[PDB]
Amino acid sequence: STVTKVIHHELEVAASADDIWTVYSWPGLAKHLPDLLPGAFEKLEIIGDGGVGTILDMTFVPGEFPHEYKEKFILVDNEHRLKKVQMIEGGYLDLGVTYYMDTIHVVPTGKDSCVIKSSTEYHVKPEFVKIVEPLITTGPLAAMADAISKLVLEH
Template sequence: MHGLVVANTVVAATACSVWDIYGSLQVVTIINTFLPDVLGTVKVLEGDGQVGTLLNVTFPLGTPGVGYMKEKITKVNYKKRVKETQTIEGGFLALGFKRYITQYKIIENNFTSSIIRSTIKYEVDDKLSNLASIVNTKLVETLAETVGKYLTEKKAPP
């Protein structure tokens, strides 16, 4: 069984400034600084944020499952402002999923706002299709909102 869930989060920041965060490892700093109790902590195991970079996410205490996941950055397209990661160990794979991919696309909305389109693509054995109900966009939306808030407050006059 293949599945797809998508969230579009409008943020009050330019697509260029949002991509500066998502298109680099700065997104790791945002997660570790503002969202460790929600998303966990991210450690770069290898790489510089480009394709092939390996990340280890340690989930917050009380998160169901194995408590961690390893992700690999599989796509970074600066022109289209698209970044994709694939879980290679732990996380949803430990629950029985065959494939779990998260994609972020930054879309210019107007001169002062953009849309962060977060897409989760997954594959799970038909016998475990009930697991599909646990896939949602809540955490990627929280990240998008946090990035938007960070950029808005960062640019606000003192």
């Protein structure tokens, strides 16, 4: 007995899908997350080399919600330019959520242009659907999008 919710975010960028994708899939990116997102993390623990299987423990600055959660780099698909990251411990999972997934899909539009289609799907017990829907947003994915965009839009 869980309700499924899926939220979406899109971002057009004046760079090739391939260029934006190398950065998203780049295993060194994990240890550079504080560089892309200054002041977003109080503490970031990386278990693994940044490729699939890598777990990230994330604790945020006092006041913010999810104060702390773990994450797993679960899947990568280079041909489709697709990446799935799962919340595995803490955060919304202590708040009636039984499943939490992020999908990032970089789809080309023209020769030197693409969309970043970021989505997150979750499953919540009906009792917690109203407690938790004003909390879960597309924020963390939109932040990844804006940072990667700007870092790559440098000739």
